[PDB]
């Protein structure tokens, strides 16, 4: 008899994972042992498709950052997670003066001490984050872009004037709460192909559903 | 209220909207079986 | 069973007409679109037309288009195809299918040879 | 105008090894099906949809492609599936391919 389940708050709940930084010592990969991770929240892969139901939306995110050497190890190092809000300039280095700006909250912690949690605000100038902008801001490449929806970066780094003894991952969990939407969409049948646009393959263009043989078959 | 693709047989990528409707003709002989499906909305078919 | 078994040919000479029919068994036969498919001896397969469920919508390749016809009756579930001025790249076993696309049964054929 | 060519024309099998035949088109294509031709017998429906097995069709059997490079892959191999396979397509002038002779090895 109950309908708790199926509210917004219920089915947008859970804290999913949305990013990872890897922080090898011998490397391609970052290799100022550093890293700028801007907020996506696609980086849980099934979540755009969820999101994409609703044209305008509302939230808070509650993240948690979970640390460890690639099999999974603890170990004593401390570690410097940076929020760097929209407007404000991501570190370009592992010296950017950035890291020292007060007005970048940042968050120190062992890899020992449990897992770091802090809830964000909806940033957005705009009443609400909204997935699609049938327009250009004031043929072209910025059709789509409401650039109002950063939500900010994420600037990781070992802590200390050295590179760090042990390679490192992070990985970044995200809990969407106090939620609300507006104007319900058709539900995406074909295959995502950009980060940006709704573009879609025009040959590969299948059927919402399995087909089958006859109308009178079962 | 979402349209129903009873009608799911056509794949031919320009027949797709054939889906959507199914049809009723003169051919069709009185007691004839026009069309049948399932009430399962979650699995594959028609309720997709 | 769903049951496809087609009836005329032999032997015609180049320039004759002929008419082939298909009987259907165990299948409500107006709900369905069919087709003739014919195999050059024992290796190619070449389509040569459809019908619609009803009447509606006949569909011919561009190797016979002019000279076949593909016709129902949908009071005894049988299939027809007359062919007019036969030629000699005409010989070649004739199947009727149903179209469900993709062809589920085939029939056994008839035999088509046209030749002086 | 859209041909399928089937490699190769002719296979042996041990049997109870794997089999790989091949369709493959000179445009690109939405799907592919194929049937089997025993001698003296009509073709039967074998593979739907590229990836979809008729009820009768062993488990055995398998079928994957995409664009213009489609295969029907059979693992492991038996006695009784030597026959000749013809790949189909369904975009415009529904052509058939040119089959593939599967025979028995010894």
């Known amino acids: 008899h109950s309908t708790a389940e199926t509210t917004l708050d219920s089915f947008f709940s859970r804290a999913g994972l949305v990013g990872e930084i890897d922080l090898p010592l011998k490397g391609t990969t970052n290799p100022n042992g550093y890293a700028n991770w801007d907020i996506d929240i696609t980086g849980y892969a099934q979540m755009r498709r969820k999101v994409e139901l609703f044209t305008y939306m509302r939230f808070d995110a509650e993240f948690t950052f979970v640390a460890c050497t690639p099999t999974g190890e603890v170990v004593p190092q401390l570690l410097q997670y940076m929020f760097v809000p929209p407007g404000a300039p991501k570190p370009d280095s592992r010296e950017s003066l950035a890291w020292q700006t007060a007005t970048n909250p940042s968050v120190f912690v062992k890899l020992s001490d449990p897992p770091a949690q802090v809830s964000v605000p909806f940033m957005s100038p705009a009443s609400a984050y909204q997935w699609f902008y049938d327009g250009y801001p004031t043929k072209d490449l910025e059709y789509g872009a409401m650039p109002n929806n950063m939500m900010g970066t994420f600037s990781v780094r070992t802590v200390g004037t050295s590179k760090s003894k042990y390679p490192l991952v992070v990985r970044i969990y995200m809990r969407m709460k106090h939620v609300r939407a507006w104007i319900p969409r058709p539900m995406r049948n074909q295959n995502y192909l950009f980060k940006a646009n709704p573009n879609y393959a025009g040959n590969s263009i299948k059927p919402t559903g399995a087909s089958r043989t006859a109308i009178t078959t079962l | 209220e979402t349209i129903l693709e009873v009608n799911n047989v056509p794949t031919n990528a320009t027949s797709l909207m054939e889906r959507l409707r199914f049809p009723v003709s003169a051919q069709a002989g009185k007691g004839e079986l026009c069309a049948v499906f399932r009430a399962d909305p979650g699995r594959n078919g028609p309720w997709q | 069973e769903v049951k496809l078994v087609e009836s005329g040919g032999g032997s015609v000479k180049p320039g004759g007409s002929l008419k082939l029919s298909c009987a259907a068994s165990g299948f409500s036969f107006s709900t369905y679109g069919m087709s003739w498919v014919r195999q050059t001896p024992e290796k190619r397969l070449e389509w040569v037309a459809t019908?619609?469920?009803?009447?509606?919508?006949?569909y011919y390749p561009d190797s016979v288009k002019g000279r076949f016809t593909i016709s129902r009756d949908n009071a005894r579930n049988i299939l027809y195809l007359q062919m007019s001025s036969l030629r000699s790249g005409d010989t070649a076993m004739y199947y009727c299918a149903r179209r469900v696309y993709y062809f589920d049964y085939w029939g056994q054929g008839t035999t088509l040879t046209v030749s002086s | 105008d859209i041909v399928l060519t089937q490699s190769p024309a002719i296979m042996s099998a041990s049997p109870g090894e794997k089999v790989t035949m091949t369709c493959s088109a000179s445009s690109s294509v939405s799907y592919i099906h194929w049937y089997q031709q025993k001698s003296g017998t009509s073709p039967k429906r074998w593979i739907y949809?590229?990836?979809r097995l008729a009820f009768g069709v062993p488990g055995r059997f398998s079928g994957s492609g995409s664009g213009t490079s489609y295969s029907l892959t059979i693992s492991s191999m038996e006695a009784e599936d030597a026959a000749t396979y013809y790949c189909?397509?369904?975009?415009?002038?529904?052509?058939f391919g040119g089959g593939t002779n599967l025979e028995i090895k010894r």
């Open positions: 949809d590229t990836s």
């Open positions: 019908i619609s469920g009803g009447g509606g919508y006949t």
């Open positions: 189909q397509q369904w975009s415009s002038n529904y052509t």
